[PDB]
Design a protein around this ligand. Structure first.
Ligand SMILES: [Co+2]
Ligand SMILES: [Co+2]
Ligand SMILES: [Co+2]
Ligand SMILES: [Co+2]
Lengths: 333, 333
């Protein structure tokens, strides 16, 4: 155990099919979505119902493609009000042998099912209620199913980590101290990564069990270094989603990643696509002038295009294996 | 048929148990919520699960209290992402004989499950998708159950009827023209009632099938008169919720109502409480200094306190019956 070792509580990952040893995780995609729906999809159920059979078949087929690439584990980052479904994920994992960790947490203020806790917080101690929720889901189970969350998912807004969002960061830090559970995050439009890192550590969370996400959203390597200064891991986890919204191109992403890799940060970098394998609600109807932005936005893009492009640029096999197997065994294992 | 008669399409109300004649509605509470949860409650399902047996017993008991007061119909105004459940409402109606109409629509921008259609609208024709949804739910059924919505529910924000909200007002107006379905609304903090009235009529919706809501939220009688100028009905429908948020006291509400009644607007005024009979999510924990605001916030308050206070102030039995039986038979029947 060389470097920054986590622990001070638990030593194994909790997947939707149960406990798994750090050594069993194999290469991991740390931020993906088996199913995902923007909050409000369930109100469009009349015309956009879930086709369980089509979903299970499509999701298992994508799981099989991943296992063929040697990926043995996926961390499903779906927030509580964005379609999270542990029972479903379990079916997918049982059908294929792909290991899946699910999350506990709500999305950022402007993008999650926010109204509920914003309201409870105006009438009482919402931080304590969010903490009780994260702890029960991480230690006992989600919705009386016995399936436990393997990560706590946090998210902040673009201009600041809002008071609403901080209720979750405080509750999350506490659960992290008490269970050692991993924490992954969402940053909005390439901002707040350093503030996030600072707030979670200042609150006592283990920086070795923290992964600040969507860091590929910023193209100034200075921004990632300031974040890395905290000891936390960062993830370029929207690889393949290019130009959509404020998103950069993978060429801008690989430029910043190779700079950081050449500075010795391999032990702190992770890669994922933030893909959605099956959308909840009605099928998205993507405009013509947007097809390029999502063309490479699927879960086989890193294995097929990215790792080879890195290797051809000078990145070693040991660096690649540290990002894809080394880092997750320690952060989630 | 004297006065402003609706029609030009359909002539009866659609309840969760089926079609009902205008003459069968009896006295009506036009804006209530059998069950309600702020968007995000379903993500708090681990610690705040729905207890169907406790819910059915509590809801049927409240339904029985209403029928004892002679109320035979309730219009459930719950938006699509706020706990709407037609199957449940049907159980309550079947168990008791209370007639219940349910709605189709999403809540105002800052309070509903907004993310989903805000997103679809950035990628395509969300107005058409919302229109298809309202029309199928009003004419065929909600979620493949065969239970149809009897009203379209619309809502706007405080400072303006937002572009997002206008997608729904446009779709609603179209469905209104094609089916004659009634439209009820939500106004936020006593603003936009006139703008609402203006936009729906300018769009061709039938002002005789429009009820602008939460109009008791404003205490300047000039505001209601400008709204009434459009031919639409208005509702003082949060009666009993006092001082909570920007809400006035019932004494301020009755002062504006008696002024309007003394100006001959009885044919255009309706009364309801906007109560919630059973909350979804964890039980609300209401702070001590807030007990007065919700004390009279339940569905028997109008029948027991309000109608008598009006009658003692000079309002006649015919005026009362026009607001509670006359008006709804025409607007929803
Ligand atoms: Co995200
Ligand atoms: Co994500
Ligand atoms: Co309302
Ligand atoms: Co309401």
């Amino acid at each position: 155990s060389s470097g920054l070792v986590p622990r001070g509580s638990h030593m194994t990952a909790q997947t939707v099919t149960g406990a798994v040893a750090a050594a069993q995780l194999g290469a991991t995609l740390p931020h993906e979505h088996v199913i995902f729906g923007y909050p409000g999809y369930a109100g469009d159920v009349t015309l956009g119902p879930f086709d369980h059979a089509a979903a299970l078949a499509s999701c298992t087929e994508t799981a099989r493609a991943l296992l063929a690439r040697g990926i043995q584990t996926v961390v499903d980052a779906t927030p509580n009000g964005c379609g999270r479904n542990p029972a479903f994920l379990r079916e997918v994992s049982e059908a294929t042998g792909l290991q899946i960790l699910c999350a506990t947490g709500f999305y950022y203020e402007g993008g999650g099912a926010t109204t509920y806790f914003k309201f409870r917080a105006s009438l009482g101690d919402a931080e304590s209620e969010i903490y009780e929720m994260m702890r029960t889901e991480v230690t006992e189970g989600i919705a009386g199913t016995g399936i436990r969350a393997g990560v706590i998912k946090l998210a902040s807004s673009r201009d600041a980590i809002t008071p609403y969002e901080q209720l979750f960061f405080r509750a999350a830090a506490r659960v992290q101290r008490e269970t050692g559970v991993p924490i992954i995050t969402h940053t909005q439009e390439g901002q707040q990564g350093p503030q996030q890192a600072e707030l979670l550590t200042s609150l006592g969370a283990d920086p070795a069990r923290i992964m600040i996400g969507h860091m590929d959203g910023n193209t100034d390597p200075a921004y990632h270094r300031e974040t890395l200064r905290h000891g936390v891991s960062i993830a370029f986890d929207r690889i393949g989603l290019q130009g959509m919204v404020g998103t950069p191109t993978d060429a801008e992403r690989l430029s910043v990643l190779t700079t950081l890799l050449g500075e010795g940060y391999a032990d702190r970098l992770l890669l994922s696509h933030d893909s959605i394998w099956h959308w909840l609600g009605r099928p998205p109807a993507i405009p013509e002038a947007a097809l390029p932005a999502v063309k490479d936005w699927h879960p086989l893009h890193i294995s097929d295009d990215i790792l080879p492009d890195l290797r051809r640029r000078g990145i070693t096999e040991e660096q690649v294996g540290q990002m894809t197997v080394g880092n997750p065994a320690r952060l989630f294992g």
